Amino acid sequence: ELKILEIIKEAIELGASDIHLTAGAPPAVRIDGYIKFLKDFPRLTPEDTQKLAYSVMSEKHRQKLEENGQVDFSFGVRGVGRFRANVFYQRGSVAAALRSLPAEIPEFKKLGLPDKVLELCHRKMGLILVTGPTGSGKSTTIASMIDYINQTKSYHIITIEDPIEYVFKHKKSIVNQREVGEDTKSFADALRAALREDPDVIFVGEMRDLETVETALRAAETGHLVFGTLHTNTAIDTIHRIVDIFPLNQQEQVRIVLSFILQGIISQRLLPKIGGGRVLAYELLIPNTAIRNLIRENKLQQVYSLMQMQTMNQTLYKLYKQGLITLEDAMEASPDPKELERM
Amino acid sequence: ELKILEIIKEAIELGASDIHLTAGAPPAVRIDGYIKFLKDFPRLTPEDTQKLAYSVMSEKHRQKLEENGQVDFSFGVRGVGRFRANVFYQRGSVAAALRSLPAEIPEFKKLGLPDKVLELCHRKMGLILVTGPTGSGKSTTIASMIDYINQTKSYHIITIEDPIEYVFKHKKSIVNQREVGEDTKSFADALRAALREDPDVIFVGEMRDLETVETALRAAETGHLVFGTLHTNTAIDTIHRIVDIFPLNQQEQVRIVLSFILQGIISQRLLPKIGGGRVLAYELLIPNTAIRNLIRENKLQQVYSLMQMQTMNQTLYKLYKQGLITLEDAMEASPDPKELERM
Amino acid sequence: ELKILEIIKEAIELGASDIHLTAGAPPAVRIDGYIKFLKDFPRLTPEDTQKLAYSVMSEKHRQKLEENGQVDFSFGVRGVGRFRANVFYQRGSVAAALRSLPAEIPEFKKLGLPDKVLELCHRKMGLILVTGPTGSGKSTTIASMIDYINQTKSYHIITIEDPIEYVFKHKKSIVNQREVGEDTKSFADALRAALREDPDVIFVGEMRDLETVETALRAAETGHLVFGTLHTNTAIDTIHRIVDIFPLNQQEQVRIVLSFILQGIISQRLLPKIGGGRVLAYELLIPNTAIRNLIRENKLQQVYSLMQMQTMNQTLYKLYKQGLITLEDAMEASPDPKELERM
Ligand SMILES: Nc1ncnc2c1ncn2[C@@H]1O[C@H](COP(=O)(O)OP(=O)(O)O)[C@@H](O)[C@H]1O
C-alpha cells in the first residue's frame, strides 16, 4: 500500500513534475502545475509520512532533520531516475516534496550563449564564475561546459555540489561528484581534499564562505580550472562581492591575484519567452590583456565603460528587438532602467 | 488537584475567553471581560506554577524562557482545542496567560470587504500585503483568502506563521503551516526552504527584517503568490516603509520591482460597532496599468490624489453615515482629520 | 582480475604518475598528463571499488572514512615502492587516487639530462626554473640537483615545499625543509623568513603568486640560488608567464632584471618508454652573453630562432630516432606538430 517506491511509480506514470506528501491528506502529485491527489491506493496518509521519508534519508539526514526543521538532499531510484527531496517538519508532523531531476544535460548550443564562452573550457587554469539568482539555471550552464569538457578532454573532473543537480556520464574524462551531507561533511574539507585527489577541473559548488573562496582561488592560481558560482547580479558586483568577504588588511592583494586568474564572469537570468517560456539573458566578461590592468588598479566602473565583452541591458535589447521578451519583463530583470529604452 | 489539563477543563466549562496564572493567588479565568478565581479546587497556586507551565512547553521553549523573560507559542489539547500561551517571569516567579485560539476560519463575506479583494486570490503571482496594527485582524483577513484558495484551487499553500493562528483544513489545496520556534529556527531559513519546497502560495508571516523582505519579493517576482503582513497604517506608508529598510544605494530598484509585483495593499483597523462591537475599516489599493507608472517614478502622494481604489477616511464616511461607528471613534483611527467632517 | 596489487602492476609498466579509480568506468591511469583507461583486464569497476580500497587501508582509516568523507595516507608495496592514497566518497560510491612516493632521491645521471644543467648547481646566484605539468617529475629533477649540492658544497639549503616530496640527508650542506600547512602558515611568510634565516640555496616551492615571485626574484638578485618551479610548457612561455603576473606599469622592469638573473629554464615532461615506461623529455635554455640582450629588448621568438641551447621537439627527434618513444606519443606532448616529422 504505502511504499514510497510505489508512489514514485504512479508519479511518472501520470507524467509528473512533483510529488508532495503531507499529514492530513493522501499523497499528491503536480501535473502541469495543478495538484491532484491520487487517492488511488495511498490513503489519507497517517502521521506516519514519518516512515515514508525516513526510508529515503540516510542517517546523516535524519539526524539533521532534528537539529534544524528541514533537510535538502538527493537520492536515486535505480528503477527510474534520481530525485531531489526536501523533508520538513510542518505541524508537529512530517512532510516532503520530491522533484524530478534532469537525466540528460542539454548540449551547449541550445543554451543561448556565444562560443567565446565554450572557449573558456579550453583554458589551462583560472576562475570561471557563473553567478545568478536561484532558478537562473547556472547549474544548467555549468553542467553543459563541464560535460563539453567531459567529452572533449582527457581529464579528471571533480565537483563538490549541493546537491548533485546533473549526473555526469563516462567519456574521455573521468568524473567524480561529491554531494555535500551525503559524501562529505562540508564544502570545506571536501574541497580541501579535492586539492590532493589530483584534479583537473574543480567545481566549488557555491562560494558563500571566506575559507572556501580562499582555496578556490589558491586552486585556480595553481594549475586547475576552478568553476565557481554565486548569487550576485552583474560582473562588477561579483568581483566586488568576493573581495568584500575578505579582511581589508590585505583586501587589495586579492583584487590583484583576481586580475590574473579571473578568466570569465557570466551572470545569468531566466525569463518567460513569447513561445514556451524558456529564454536566457546574460552579461559576459572575459578579461583581455587590457581589462586586467584596470582591475589591478581598483578602477572598476571604468570596466563598465569598456563593456560593448557585453553588458546585461545590451543582451536584452538584442533580445527584445527580435521579439522574444516583453518591453516590460526585461525593464524588470535589468539592473539599470537608464541604459535602454533609448534603444 | 493542580493539573493544567484540568484547569482548562473548568475554563471552557465556565465558557472562558482566557485563563491566567500567577504566584500569589489561585488560577484565574476571564469570562466576558471580568476576571474570577475558580478557587473551586486549584489552591492559591504555589511558586510552582513553574511545574504547570513547564508541562506544556517543549524543550525549545523552556530554554528560551531563560534567555529572555518570556515566550510566545501554541500547543494543543486534542481533548478540546488548541491554545495560545505566553509564560513569563514575573516577580522572580512564573506566570502564564492562555487564550483560546479560534476553531474555524470565517467565510470571507462576513468580513466586510469588497470582491475585487477576493479577486486577488486569482492572481498568478506577486505581493499582497495586509498591513495593520496589532488586533486589527490581519490574520483573520489572511486566513480567509488563503482558505478561499484552499477550497477553490488545486494548490500547495505554505505558511510560515508566528504563531499559527488558524489551522487550515483539507480541500483542493494541500496546506503546510510552519510555526516558528516550534518547527524552524527562524523566519529566515524557514522561508528560504519554503522556496525549494515547491510552493504555490507562500505566507511570510511578518516582514520586520531586510532579508525576509528580500526573498519575499524574490519569490513573488518568480511565479508565486506571496502574502506578506506588516504594521504600517496606510498604503503609501507601507510602500515607503518596505523600501526604507533597504540601503539607498539601490533603493530605487525596489520601487520599480515593486511597481510590477505589487498586486494589493490592504491596511486595516478594527472598531467598536453600535451593536456587538465587531466592525472593520480598511484602505484599499489594487494597482492598475496607470498606478504602476506612478510608483515607478517615485511619484507617491500623486497616487493618494488618485484614490477615490478607495481611501481610509473614505471607508469611514461610508461607515458612519450608515450609523455603525461613532463620529468620535473614527476621527481617532483616521490618519487625517482634514479629509472628512467636510463630509 | 580485480586485485589492487595488479592494477599497480600495469600502472608502473605503462610508466605512470597516477592511478585513479571511480565507480562508473574501468580503472584509469595518468600518463604524461592525459588519462587513459586500461580496460585491458579490469572491467568497468562495480560499486565495489569499495573492496579494492578497503584492502589497502588500515582499520584506523576505514573508520576515518566514515567520520569524514575522505582520508589521506600512505602504504607500501614492497614489490615496487610506496604510494600516496586518497580514498573518498563520491556519489554514494567509493573512489581513490594513488600517486607514487619514490622516497630515495635518484643520482643525477639516471635522469637523462646533460651536465650543463648539473653545472647550474655551481652558480653563485640566480633563478633556475624547473617548469612542467603535474607528474612530469620536476621535484625528482630538483631533488637531484639540490642533493648534488648537498654533497658537493658547504652550504645551508632551505626548501619551502608543499608537501615535502623527498627528505634530504646529511652531508657537506645543512638542509632545512619547511612543509607548508605543517611548519608555516603560507609560502608567503615562510619564504619571507627564509630570507633572514641566512640561506645559501632557497627553493620556493611553486610560483603561483605575485608576492612569492617578487621576493623569489629579490632573493636571486641578492646572493642566493633561487630554485623555482611552475606549470608552463616551454621556456618562452615561462618567461612570459612570470612577467604576465606583474602590473604592466613597470612590467618592462622585470624582463630586464630577468635577463640578468635568469640562469636556466628547464621545461619537462614524462613519457611512456618502449621498455619499463620511464623516459623524460625536456627543453633547455641556459642564457649566454648573447641571449641576455634579446630578452632585455623584449625580443622573444628571436630566442626561439636561436635554440639549436635545445628545443623541445628537438629532444623528441633525438629520442624517437633511437627507438624509445612512439611517433605518436611525442606528436602529442609536443607544443608544435610543424617543427618535426620533416625529421
Ligand atoms: N467580523 C468579525 N467576525 C468575527 N470575529 C471578528 C470580527 N472582527 C474581529 N474579530 C475578532 O478579533 C480578534 C483579533 O483578530 P486576529 O486576526 O486574531 O489578530 P491580528 O490582528 O493579530 O491578525 C479575533 O479573535 C477575531 O475573531
Side-chain angles (χ1 to χ4, degrees), chain B residues 40-96:
Chain B
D40 284 64
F41 191 18
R43 231 221 158 168
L44 281 75
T45 341
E47 167 239 324
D48 292 68
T49 53
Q50 228 264 344
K51 295 210 266 253
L52 289 148
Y54 255 80
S55 61
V56 167
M57 313 158 71
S58 178
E59 263 316 281
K60 284 245 47 200
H61 297 125
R62 319 187 320 178
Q63 183 246 187
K64 254 254 260 153
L65 185 83
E66 310 295 327
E67 251 187 316
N68 313 13
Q70 72 275 356
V71 271
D72 258 322
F73 69 119
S74 26
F75 69 128
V77 181
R78 231 223 268 149
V80 47
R82 310 173 315 114
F83 289 113
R84 216 273 215 241
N86 192 329
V87 184
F88 62 94
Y89 271 96
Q90 189 257 341
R91 263 160 38 233
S93 113
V94 180

Side-chain angles (χ1 to χ4, degrees), chain C residues 108-126:
Chain C
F108 178 75
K109 53 167 199 175
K110 262 172 279 148
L111 253 58
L113 290 323
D115 320 353
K116 312 153 209 159
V117 184
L118 243 210
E119 195 181 38
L120 279 157
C121 290
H122 279 146
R123 293 312 115 206
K124 42 278 179 197
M125 76 199 49

Side-chain angles (χ1 to χ4, degrees), chain C residues 271 281-282 310-327 330-331 334 339-343:
Chain C
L271 297 93
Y282 59 91
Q310 196 155 325
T311 7
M312 230 322 198
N313 301 67
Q314 221 170 289
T315 317
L316 304 151
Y317 164 76
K318 181 180 164 96
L319 258 64
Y320 154 67
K321 88 155 200 209
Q322 222 191 336
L324 295 109
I325 50 156
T326 47
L327 184 106
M331 274 282 93
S334 176
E339 207 155 4
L340 225 55
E341 112 231 31
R342 191 192 153 183
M343 311 282 126

Side-chain angles (χ1 to χ4, degrees), chain A residues 117-165:
Chain A
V117 182
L118 241 208
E119 196 180 40
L120 282 155
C121 289
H122 279 150
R123 292 311 112 208
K124 41 272 178 200
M125 75 193 60
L127 265 165
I128 307 176
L129 314 179
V130 161
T131 74
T134 307
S136 48
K138 27 325 172 250
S139 25
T140 306
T141 309
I142 298 290
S144 277
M145 302 180 76
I146 313 286
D147 185 85
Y148 170 83
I149 291 197
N150 172 52
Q151 289 160 330
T152 57
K153 311 282 291 154
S154 275
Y155 271 2
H156 163 264
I157 309 154
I158 222 156
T159 59
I160 311 169
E161 300 171 67
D162 184 2
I164 333 141
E165 193 91 20

Side-chain angles (χ1 to χ4, degrees), chain B residues 99 102 106 110-111 133-141 165-166 270 278-280:
Chain B
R99 269 188 325 129
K110 260 172 281 147
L111 256 60
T134 306
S136 51
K138 0 18 152 232
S139 23
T140 311
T141 307
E165 194 85 23
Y166 294 92
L270 272 175
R278 233 82 195 114
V279 137
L280 104 85

Side-chain angles (χ1 to χ4, degrees), chain A residues 20 22 30 35 70 90 332, chain B residues 154 177-178 198 200 260:
Chain A
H20 275 263
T22 200
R30 193 188 291 244
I35 288 136
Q70 73 273 356
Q90 189 252 343
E332 201 198 10
Chain B
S154 273
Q177 295 167 279
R178 297 182 75 209
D198 187 62
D200 282 290
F260 179 96

Side-chain angles (χ1 to χ4, degrees), chain B residues 38 46 53 108 119 123 135 205 214 235 249 256 260 304 306:
Chain B
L38 49 125
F108 178 74
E119 196 179 40
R123 293 311 115 209
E214 215 166 296
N249 177 272
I256 316 156
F260 179 96
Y304 210 102
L306 254 307

Side-chain angles (χ1 to χ4, degrees), chain B residues 224-263:
Chain B
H224 318 91
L225 253 178
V226 166
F227 279 77
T229 95
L230 281 80
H231 291 276
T232 52
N233 255 102
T234 82
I236 62 150
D237 283 346
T238 308
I239 48 153
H240 250 133
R241 200 253 212 260
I242 75 158
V243 184
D244 262 307
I245 67 173
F246 276 89
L248 52 145
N249 177 272
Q250 17 133 206
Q251 211 198 73
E252 254 248 12
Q253 220 163 333
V254 156
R255 214 130 63 184
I256 316 156
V257 170
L258 210 62
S259 49
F260 179 96
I261 219 61
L262 216 306
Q263 284 255 30

